[PDB]
Design an enzyme around this catalytic site. Structure first.
Site, PDB file in Angstrom:
ATOM      1  N   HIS A  85       5.286  -4.562   5.818  1.00  0.00           N
ATOM      2  CA  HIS A  85       5.258  -3.162   6.245  1.00  0.00           C
ATOM      3  C   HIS A  85       4.815  -3.128   7.711  1.00  0.00           C
ATOM      4  O   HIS A  85       4.592  -4.183   8.318  1.00  0.00           O
ATOM      5  CB  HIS A  85       4.484  -2.188   5.336  1.00  0.00           C
ATOM      6  CG  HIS A  85       3.025  -2.397   5.265  1.00  0.00           C
ATOM      7  ND1 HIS A  85       2.452  -3.343   4.440  1.00  0.00           N
ATOM      8  CD2 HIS A  85       2.010  -1.750   5.860  1.00  0.00           C
ATOM      9  CE1 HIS A  85       1.141  -3.269   4.550  1.00  0.00           C
ATOM     10  NE2 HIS A  85       0.842  -2.324   5.413  1.00  0.00           N
ATOM     11  N   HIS A  87       2.088  -1.978   9.442  1.00  0.00           N
ATOM     12  CA  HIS A  87       0.719  -2.029   9.937  1.00  0.00           C
ATOM     13  C   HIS A  87       0.422  -3.354  10.640  1.00  0.00           C
ATOM     14  O   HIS A  87       1.089  -4.362  10.440  1.00  0.00           O
ATOM     15  CB  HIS A  87      -0.241  -1.792   8.788  1.00  0.00           C
ATOM     16  CG  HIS A  87      -0.286  -0.385   8.326  1.00  0.00           C
ATOM     17  ND1 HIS A  87      -0.752  -0.068   7.065  1.00  0.00           N
ATOM     18  CD2 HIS A  87      -0.040   0.787   8.931  1.00  0.00           C
ATOM     19  CE1 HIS A  87      -0.750   1.240   6.909  1.00  0.00           C
ATOM     20  NE2 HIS A  87      -0.347   1.789   8.042  1.00  0.00           N
ATOM     21  N   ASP A  89      -1.825  -5.585  10.283  1.00  0.00           N
ATOM     22  CA  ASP A  89      -2.079  -6.757   9.458  1.00  0.00           C
ATOM     23  C   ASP A  89      -0.812  -7.422   8.946  1.00  0.00           C
ATOM     24  O   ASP A  89      -0.916  -8.489   8.340  1.00  0.00           O
ATOM     25  CB  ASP A  89      -3.046  -6.432   8.308  1.00  0.00           C
ATOM     26  CG  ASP A  89      -2.578  -5.335   7.391  1.00  0.00           C
ATOM     27  OD1 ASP A  89      -2.005  -4.338   7.810  1.00  0.00           O
ATOM     28  OD2 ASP A  89      -2.919  -5.453   6.175  1.00  0.00           O
ATOM     29  N   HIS A 150       1.375   2.015  -0.854  1.00  0.00           N
ATOM     30  CA  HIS A 150       0.450   1.904   0.275  1.00  0.00           C
ATOM     31  C   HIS A 150       1.044   2.461   1.563  1.00  0.00           C
ATOM     32  O   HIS A 150       0.339   3.045   2.394  1.00  0.00           O
ATOM     33  CB  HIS A 150       0.100   0.443   0.451  1.00  0.00           C
ATOM     34  CG  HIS A 150      -0.588   0.158   1.739  1.00  0.00           C
ATOM     35  ND1 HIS A 150      -1.928   0.404   1.927  1.00  0.00           N
ATOM     36  CD2 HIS A 150      -0.127  -0.341   2.899  1.00  0.00           C
ATOM     37  CE1 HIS A 150      -2.276   0.031   3.145  1.00  0.00           C
ATOM     38  NE2 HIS A 150      -1.195  -0.378   3.772  1.00  0.00           N
ATOM     39  N   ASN A 181      -7.054   1.241   2.868  1.00  0.00           N
ATOM     40  CA  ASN A 181      -6.709   2.166   3.930  1.00  0.00           C
ATOM     41  C   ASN A 181      -5.457   2.926   3.502  1.00  0.00           C
ATOM     42  O   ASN A 181      -4.351   2.383   3.489  1.00  0.00           O
ATOM     43  CB  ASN A 181      -6.484   1.423   5.235  1.00  0.00           C
ATOM     44  CG  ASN A 181      -6.294   2.356   6.381  1.00  0.00           C
ATOM     45  OD1 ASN A 181      -5.886   3.509   6.199  1.00  0.00           O
ATOM     46  ND2 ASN A 181      -6.577   1.874   7.593  1.00  0.00           N
TER      47      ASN A 181
HETATM   48  C1  LIG Z   1      -4.002  -0.128   8.913  1.00  0.00           C
HETATM   49  C2  LIG Z   1      -4.437  -1.580   8.670  1.00  0.00           C
HETATM   50  C3  LIG Z   1      -4.378  -2.458   9.945  1.00  0.00           C
HETATM   51  C4  LIG Z   1      -5.872  -1.625   8.076  1.00  0.00           C
HETATM   52  C5  LIG Z   1      -6.992  -1.456   8.890  1.00  0.00           C
HETATM   53  C6  LIG Z   1      -8.291  -1.519   8.325  1.00  0.00           C
HETATM   54  C7  LIG Z   1      -8.495  -1.699   6.957  1.00  0.00           C
HETATM   55  C8  LIG Z   1      -7.355  -1.824   6.120  1.00  0.00           C
HETATM   56  C9  LIG Z   1      -7.187  -1.999   4.730  1.00  0.00           C
HETATM   57  C10 LIG Z   1      -8.292  -2.147   3.696  1.00  0.00           C
HETATM   58  C11 LIG Z   1      -9.465  -1.410   3.738  1.00  0.00           C
HETATM   59  C12 LIG Z   1     -10.437  -1.624   2.743  1.00  0.00           C
HETATM   60  C13 LIG Z   1     -10.237  -2.570   1.715  1.00  0.00           C
HETATM   61  C14 LIG Z   1     -11.317  -2.808   0.619  1.00  0.00           C
HETATM   62  S1  LIG Z   1     -11.083  -1.693  -0.797  1.00  0.00           S
HETATM   63  C15 LIG Z   1      -9.412  -2.044  -1.404  1.00  0.00           C
HETATM   64  N1  LIG Z   1     -12.093  -1.892  -1.932  1.00  0.00           N
HETATM   65  O1  LIG Z   1     -10.899  -0.257  -0.504  1.00  0.00           O
HETATM   66  C16 LIG Z   1      -9.035  -3.275   1.690  1.00  0.00           C
HETATM   67  F1  LIG Z   1      -8.780  -4.211   0.728  1.00  0.00           F
HETATM   68  C17 LIG Z   1      -8.076  -3.071   2.679  1.00  0.00           C
HETATM   69  C18 LIG Z   1      -5.831  -2.041   4.523  1.00  0.00           C
HETATM   70  C19 LIG Z   1      -5.109  -2.183   3.217  1.00  0.00           C
HETATM   71  O2  LIG Z   1      -5.546  -1.496   2.239  1.00  0.00           O
HETATM   72  O3  LIG Z   1      -4.065  -2.858   3.165  1.00  0.00           O
HETATM   73  N2  LIG Z   1      -5.190  -1.934   5.688  1.00  0.00           N
HETATM   74  C20 LIG Z   1      -6.071  -1.798   6.683  1.00  0.00           C
HETATM   75 ZN   LIG Z   2      -1.036  -1.385   5.543  1.00  0.00          ZN
HETATM   76 ZN   LIG Z   3      -3.113  -4.005   4.388  1.00  0.00          ZN
END
Ligand SMILES: CC(C)c1cccc2c(-c3ccc(C[S@@](C)(N)O)c(F)c3)c(C(=O)O)[nH]c12
Ligand SMILES: [Zn+2]
Ligand SMILES: [Zn+2]
Length: 232
Positions: A85, A87, A89, A150, A181
Site C-alpha cells: 500500500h 504508506h 512503511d 487498513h 494507524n
Molecule cells: C502511516 C504509517 C507510516 C504508520 C505510522 C505510524 C504508526 C503506524 C502503524 C501502527 C501503529 C500502532 C501499532 C500498534 S497497535 C496495532 N496495538 O495499535 C501498529 F501495529 C501499527 C501502522 C499500521 O497499523 O500499519 N502504520 C503506521
Molecule cells: Zn499503512
Molecule cells: Zn503499516
C-alpha cells in the site's frame, strides 16, 4: 537469537531477517514516526536464483540496510519489489531500491495515493487488482486485493509453496488490542475484507502482519475483532 525480532533486538539503523519457511523470510526494521518508535515487517521470497521483495523497510537508510542484510544472509539479488500500500512503511525506500536496480511495482491505486501523499512512487503498475477478490500471479507469489481495510489500496500476498499468508497492514498481530494507524482505513469494510481473505486462503499455515509477530490463521479473526472494537 532465534526469537522473532523486535525493536529491542535490532541495533540502531539495522534490519533483521527471520526465516519463515523454505525460501521465505520476513524482514524487520524499526522507525520513528510522530515521536514514537515502531517495528514493521516485509517479506522476501526466493524466485529461483533471484529474490522478490515485498515492502520496503520503512525509510531510505533502513532499506539500504535491508539490501545489505540480504546480501549478507542470503546472497541472491533482489530483482523486483512489490509495495502493498502507499504508506511510508511500504514505499519509503523505493528510491533506494530503484537506484540499486530493483524493479519496483504497486497497484495503480497505490501509485496514485503515494504520489498524492508525497511518498516515494513505485515505477510499474500492477493491473488486474482493482476489484475486490481479484488475484494475479507475480513470480513465486499470488497478489490478492481483499477490498478496503487498513487502506483502500491494501494488497495481501500468498506464497503457495509454503502456505504463507502475508497480510501486510490489513492484518494485526495477536497481542494487539488497538487497530494501529487507522488514518486512511475503512473500518466498516475492513471485516468484510478480512472475511474475503479467510475464504480465499483457508489453508494458510503462517500469517504475517504488517507490524508485529507472525502467527496462524487466528490473526485474521483477531484483526476483525480489534477493528470492530475500535469502530465501537
Ligand atoms: C502511516 C504509517 C507510516 C504508520 C505510522 C505510524 C504508526 C503506524 C502503524 C501502527 C501503529 C500502532 C501499532 C500498534 S497497535 C496495532 N496495538 O495499535 C501498529 F501495529 C501499527 C501502522 C499500521 O497499523 O500499519 N502504520 C503506521
Ligand atoms: Zn499503512
Ligand atoms: Zn503499516
Amino acid at each position: 537469537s532465534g526469537e522473532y525480532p523486535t525493536v529491542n533486538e535490532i541495533p540502531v539503523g539495522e534490519v533483521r531477517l527471520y526465516q519463515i519457511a523454505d525460501g521465505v523470510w520476513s524482514h524487520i526494521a524499526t522507525q520513528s514516526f510522530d515521536g514514537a518508535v515502531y517495528p514493521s515487517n516485509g517479506l522476501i521470497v526466493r524466485d529461483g536464483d533471484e529474490l522478490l521483495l515485498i515492502d520496503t523497510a520503512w525509510g531510505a537508510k533502513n532499506t539500504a540496510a535491508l539490501l545489505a542484510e540480504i546480501e549478507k544472509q542470503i546472497g541472491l539479488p533482489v530483482t523486483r519489489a512489490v509495495s502493498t500500500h502507499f504508506h511510508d512503511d511500504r514505499v519509503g525506500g523505493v528510491d533506494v531500491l530503484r537506484a540499486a536496480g530493483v524493479a519496483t511495482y504497486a497497484s495503480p491505486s497505490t501509485r496514485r495515493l503515494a504520489e498524492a501523499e508525497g511518498n516515494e512512487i513505485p515505477t510499474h503498475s500492477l493491473e488486474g487488482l482493482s476489484s475486490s477478490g481479484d488475484a494475479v500471479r507475480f513470480g513465486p507469489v499470488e497478489l490478492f486485493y481483499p477490498g478496503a481495510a487498513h487502506s483502500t489500496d491494501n494488497l495481501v500476498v500468498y506464497v503457495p509453496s509454503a502456505n504463507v499468508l502475508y497480510g501486510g497492514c490489513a492484518v494485526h498481530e495477536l497481542s494487539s488490542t488497538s487497530a494501529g494507524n487507522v488514518a486512511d482505513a475503512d473500518l466498516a469494510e475492513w471485516p468484510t475484507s478480512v472475511e474475503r481473505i479467510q475464504k480465499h486462503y483457508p489453508e494458510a499455515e503462517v500469517v504475517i502482519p504488517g507490524h508485529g509477530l507472525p502467527g496462524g490463521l487466528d490473526l485474521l479473526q483477531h484483526t476483525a475483532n480489534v477493528v470492530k472494537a475500535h469502530k465501537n
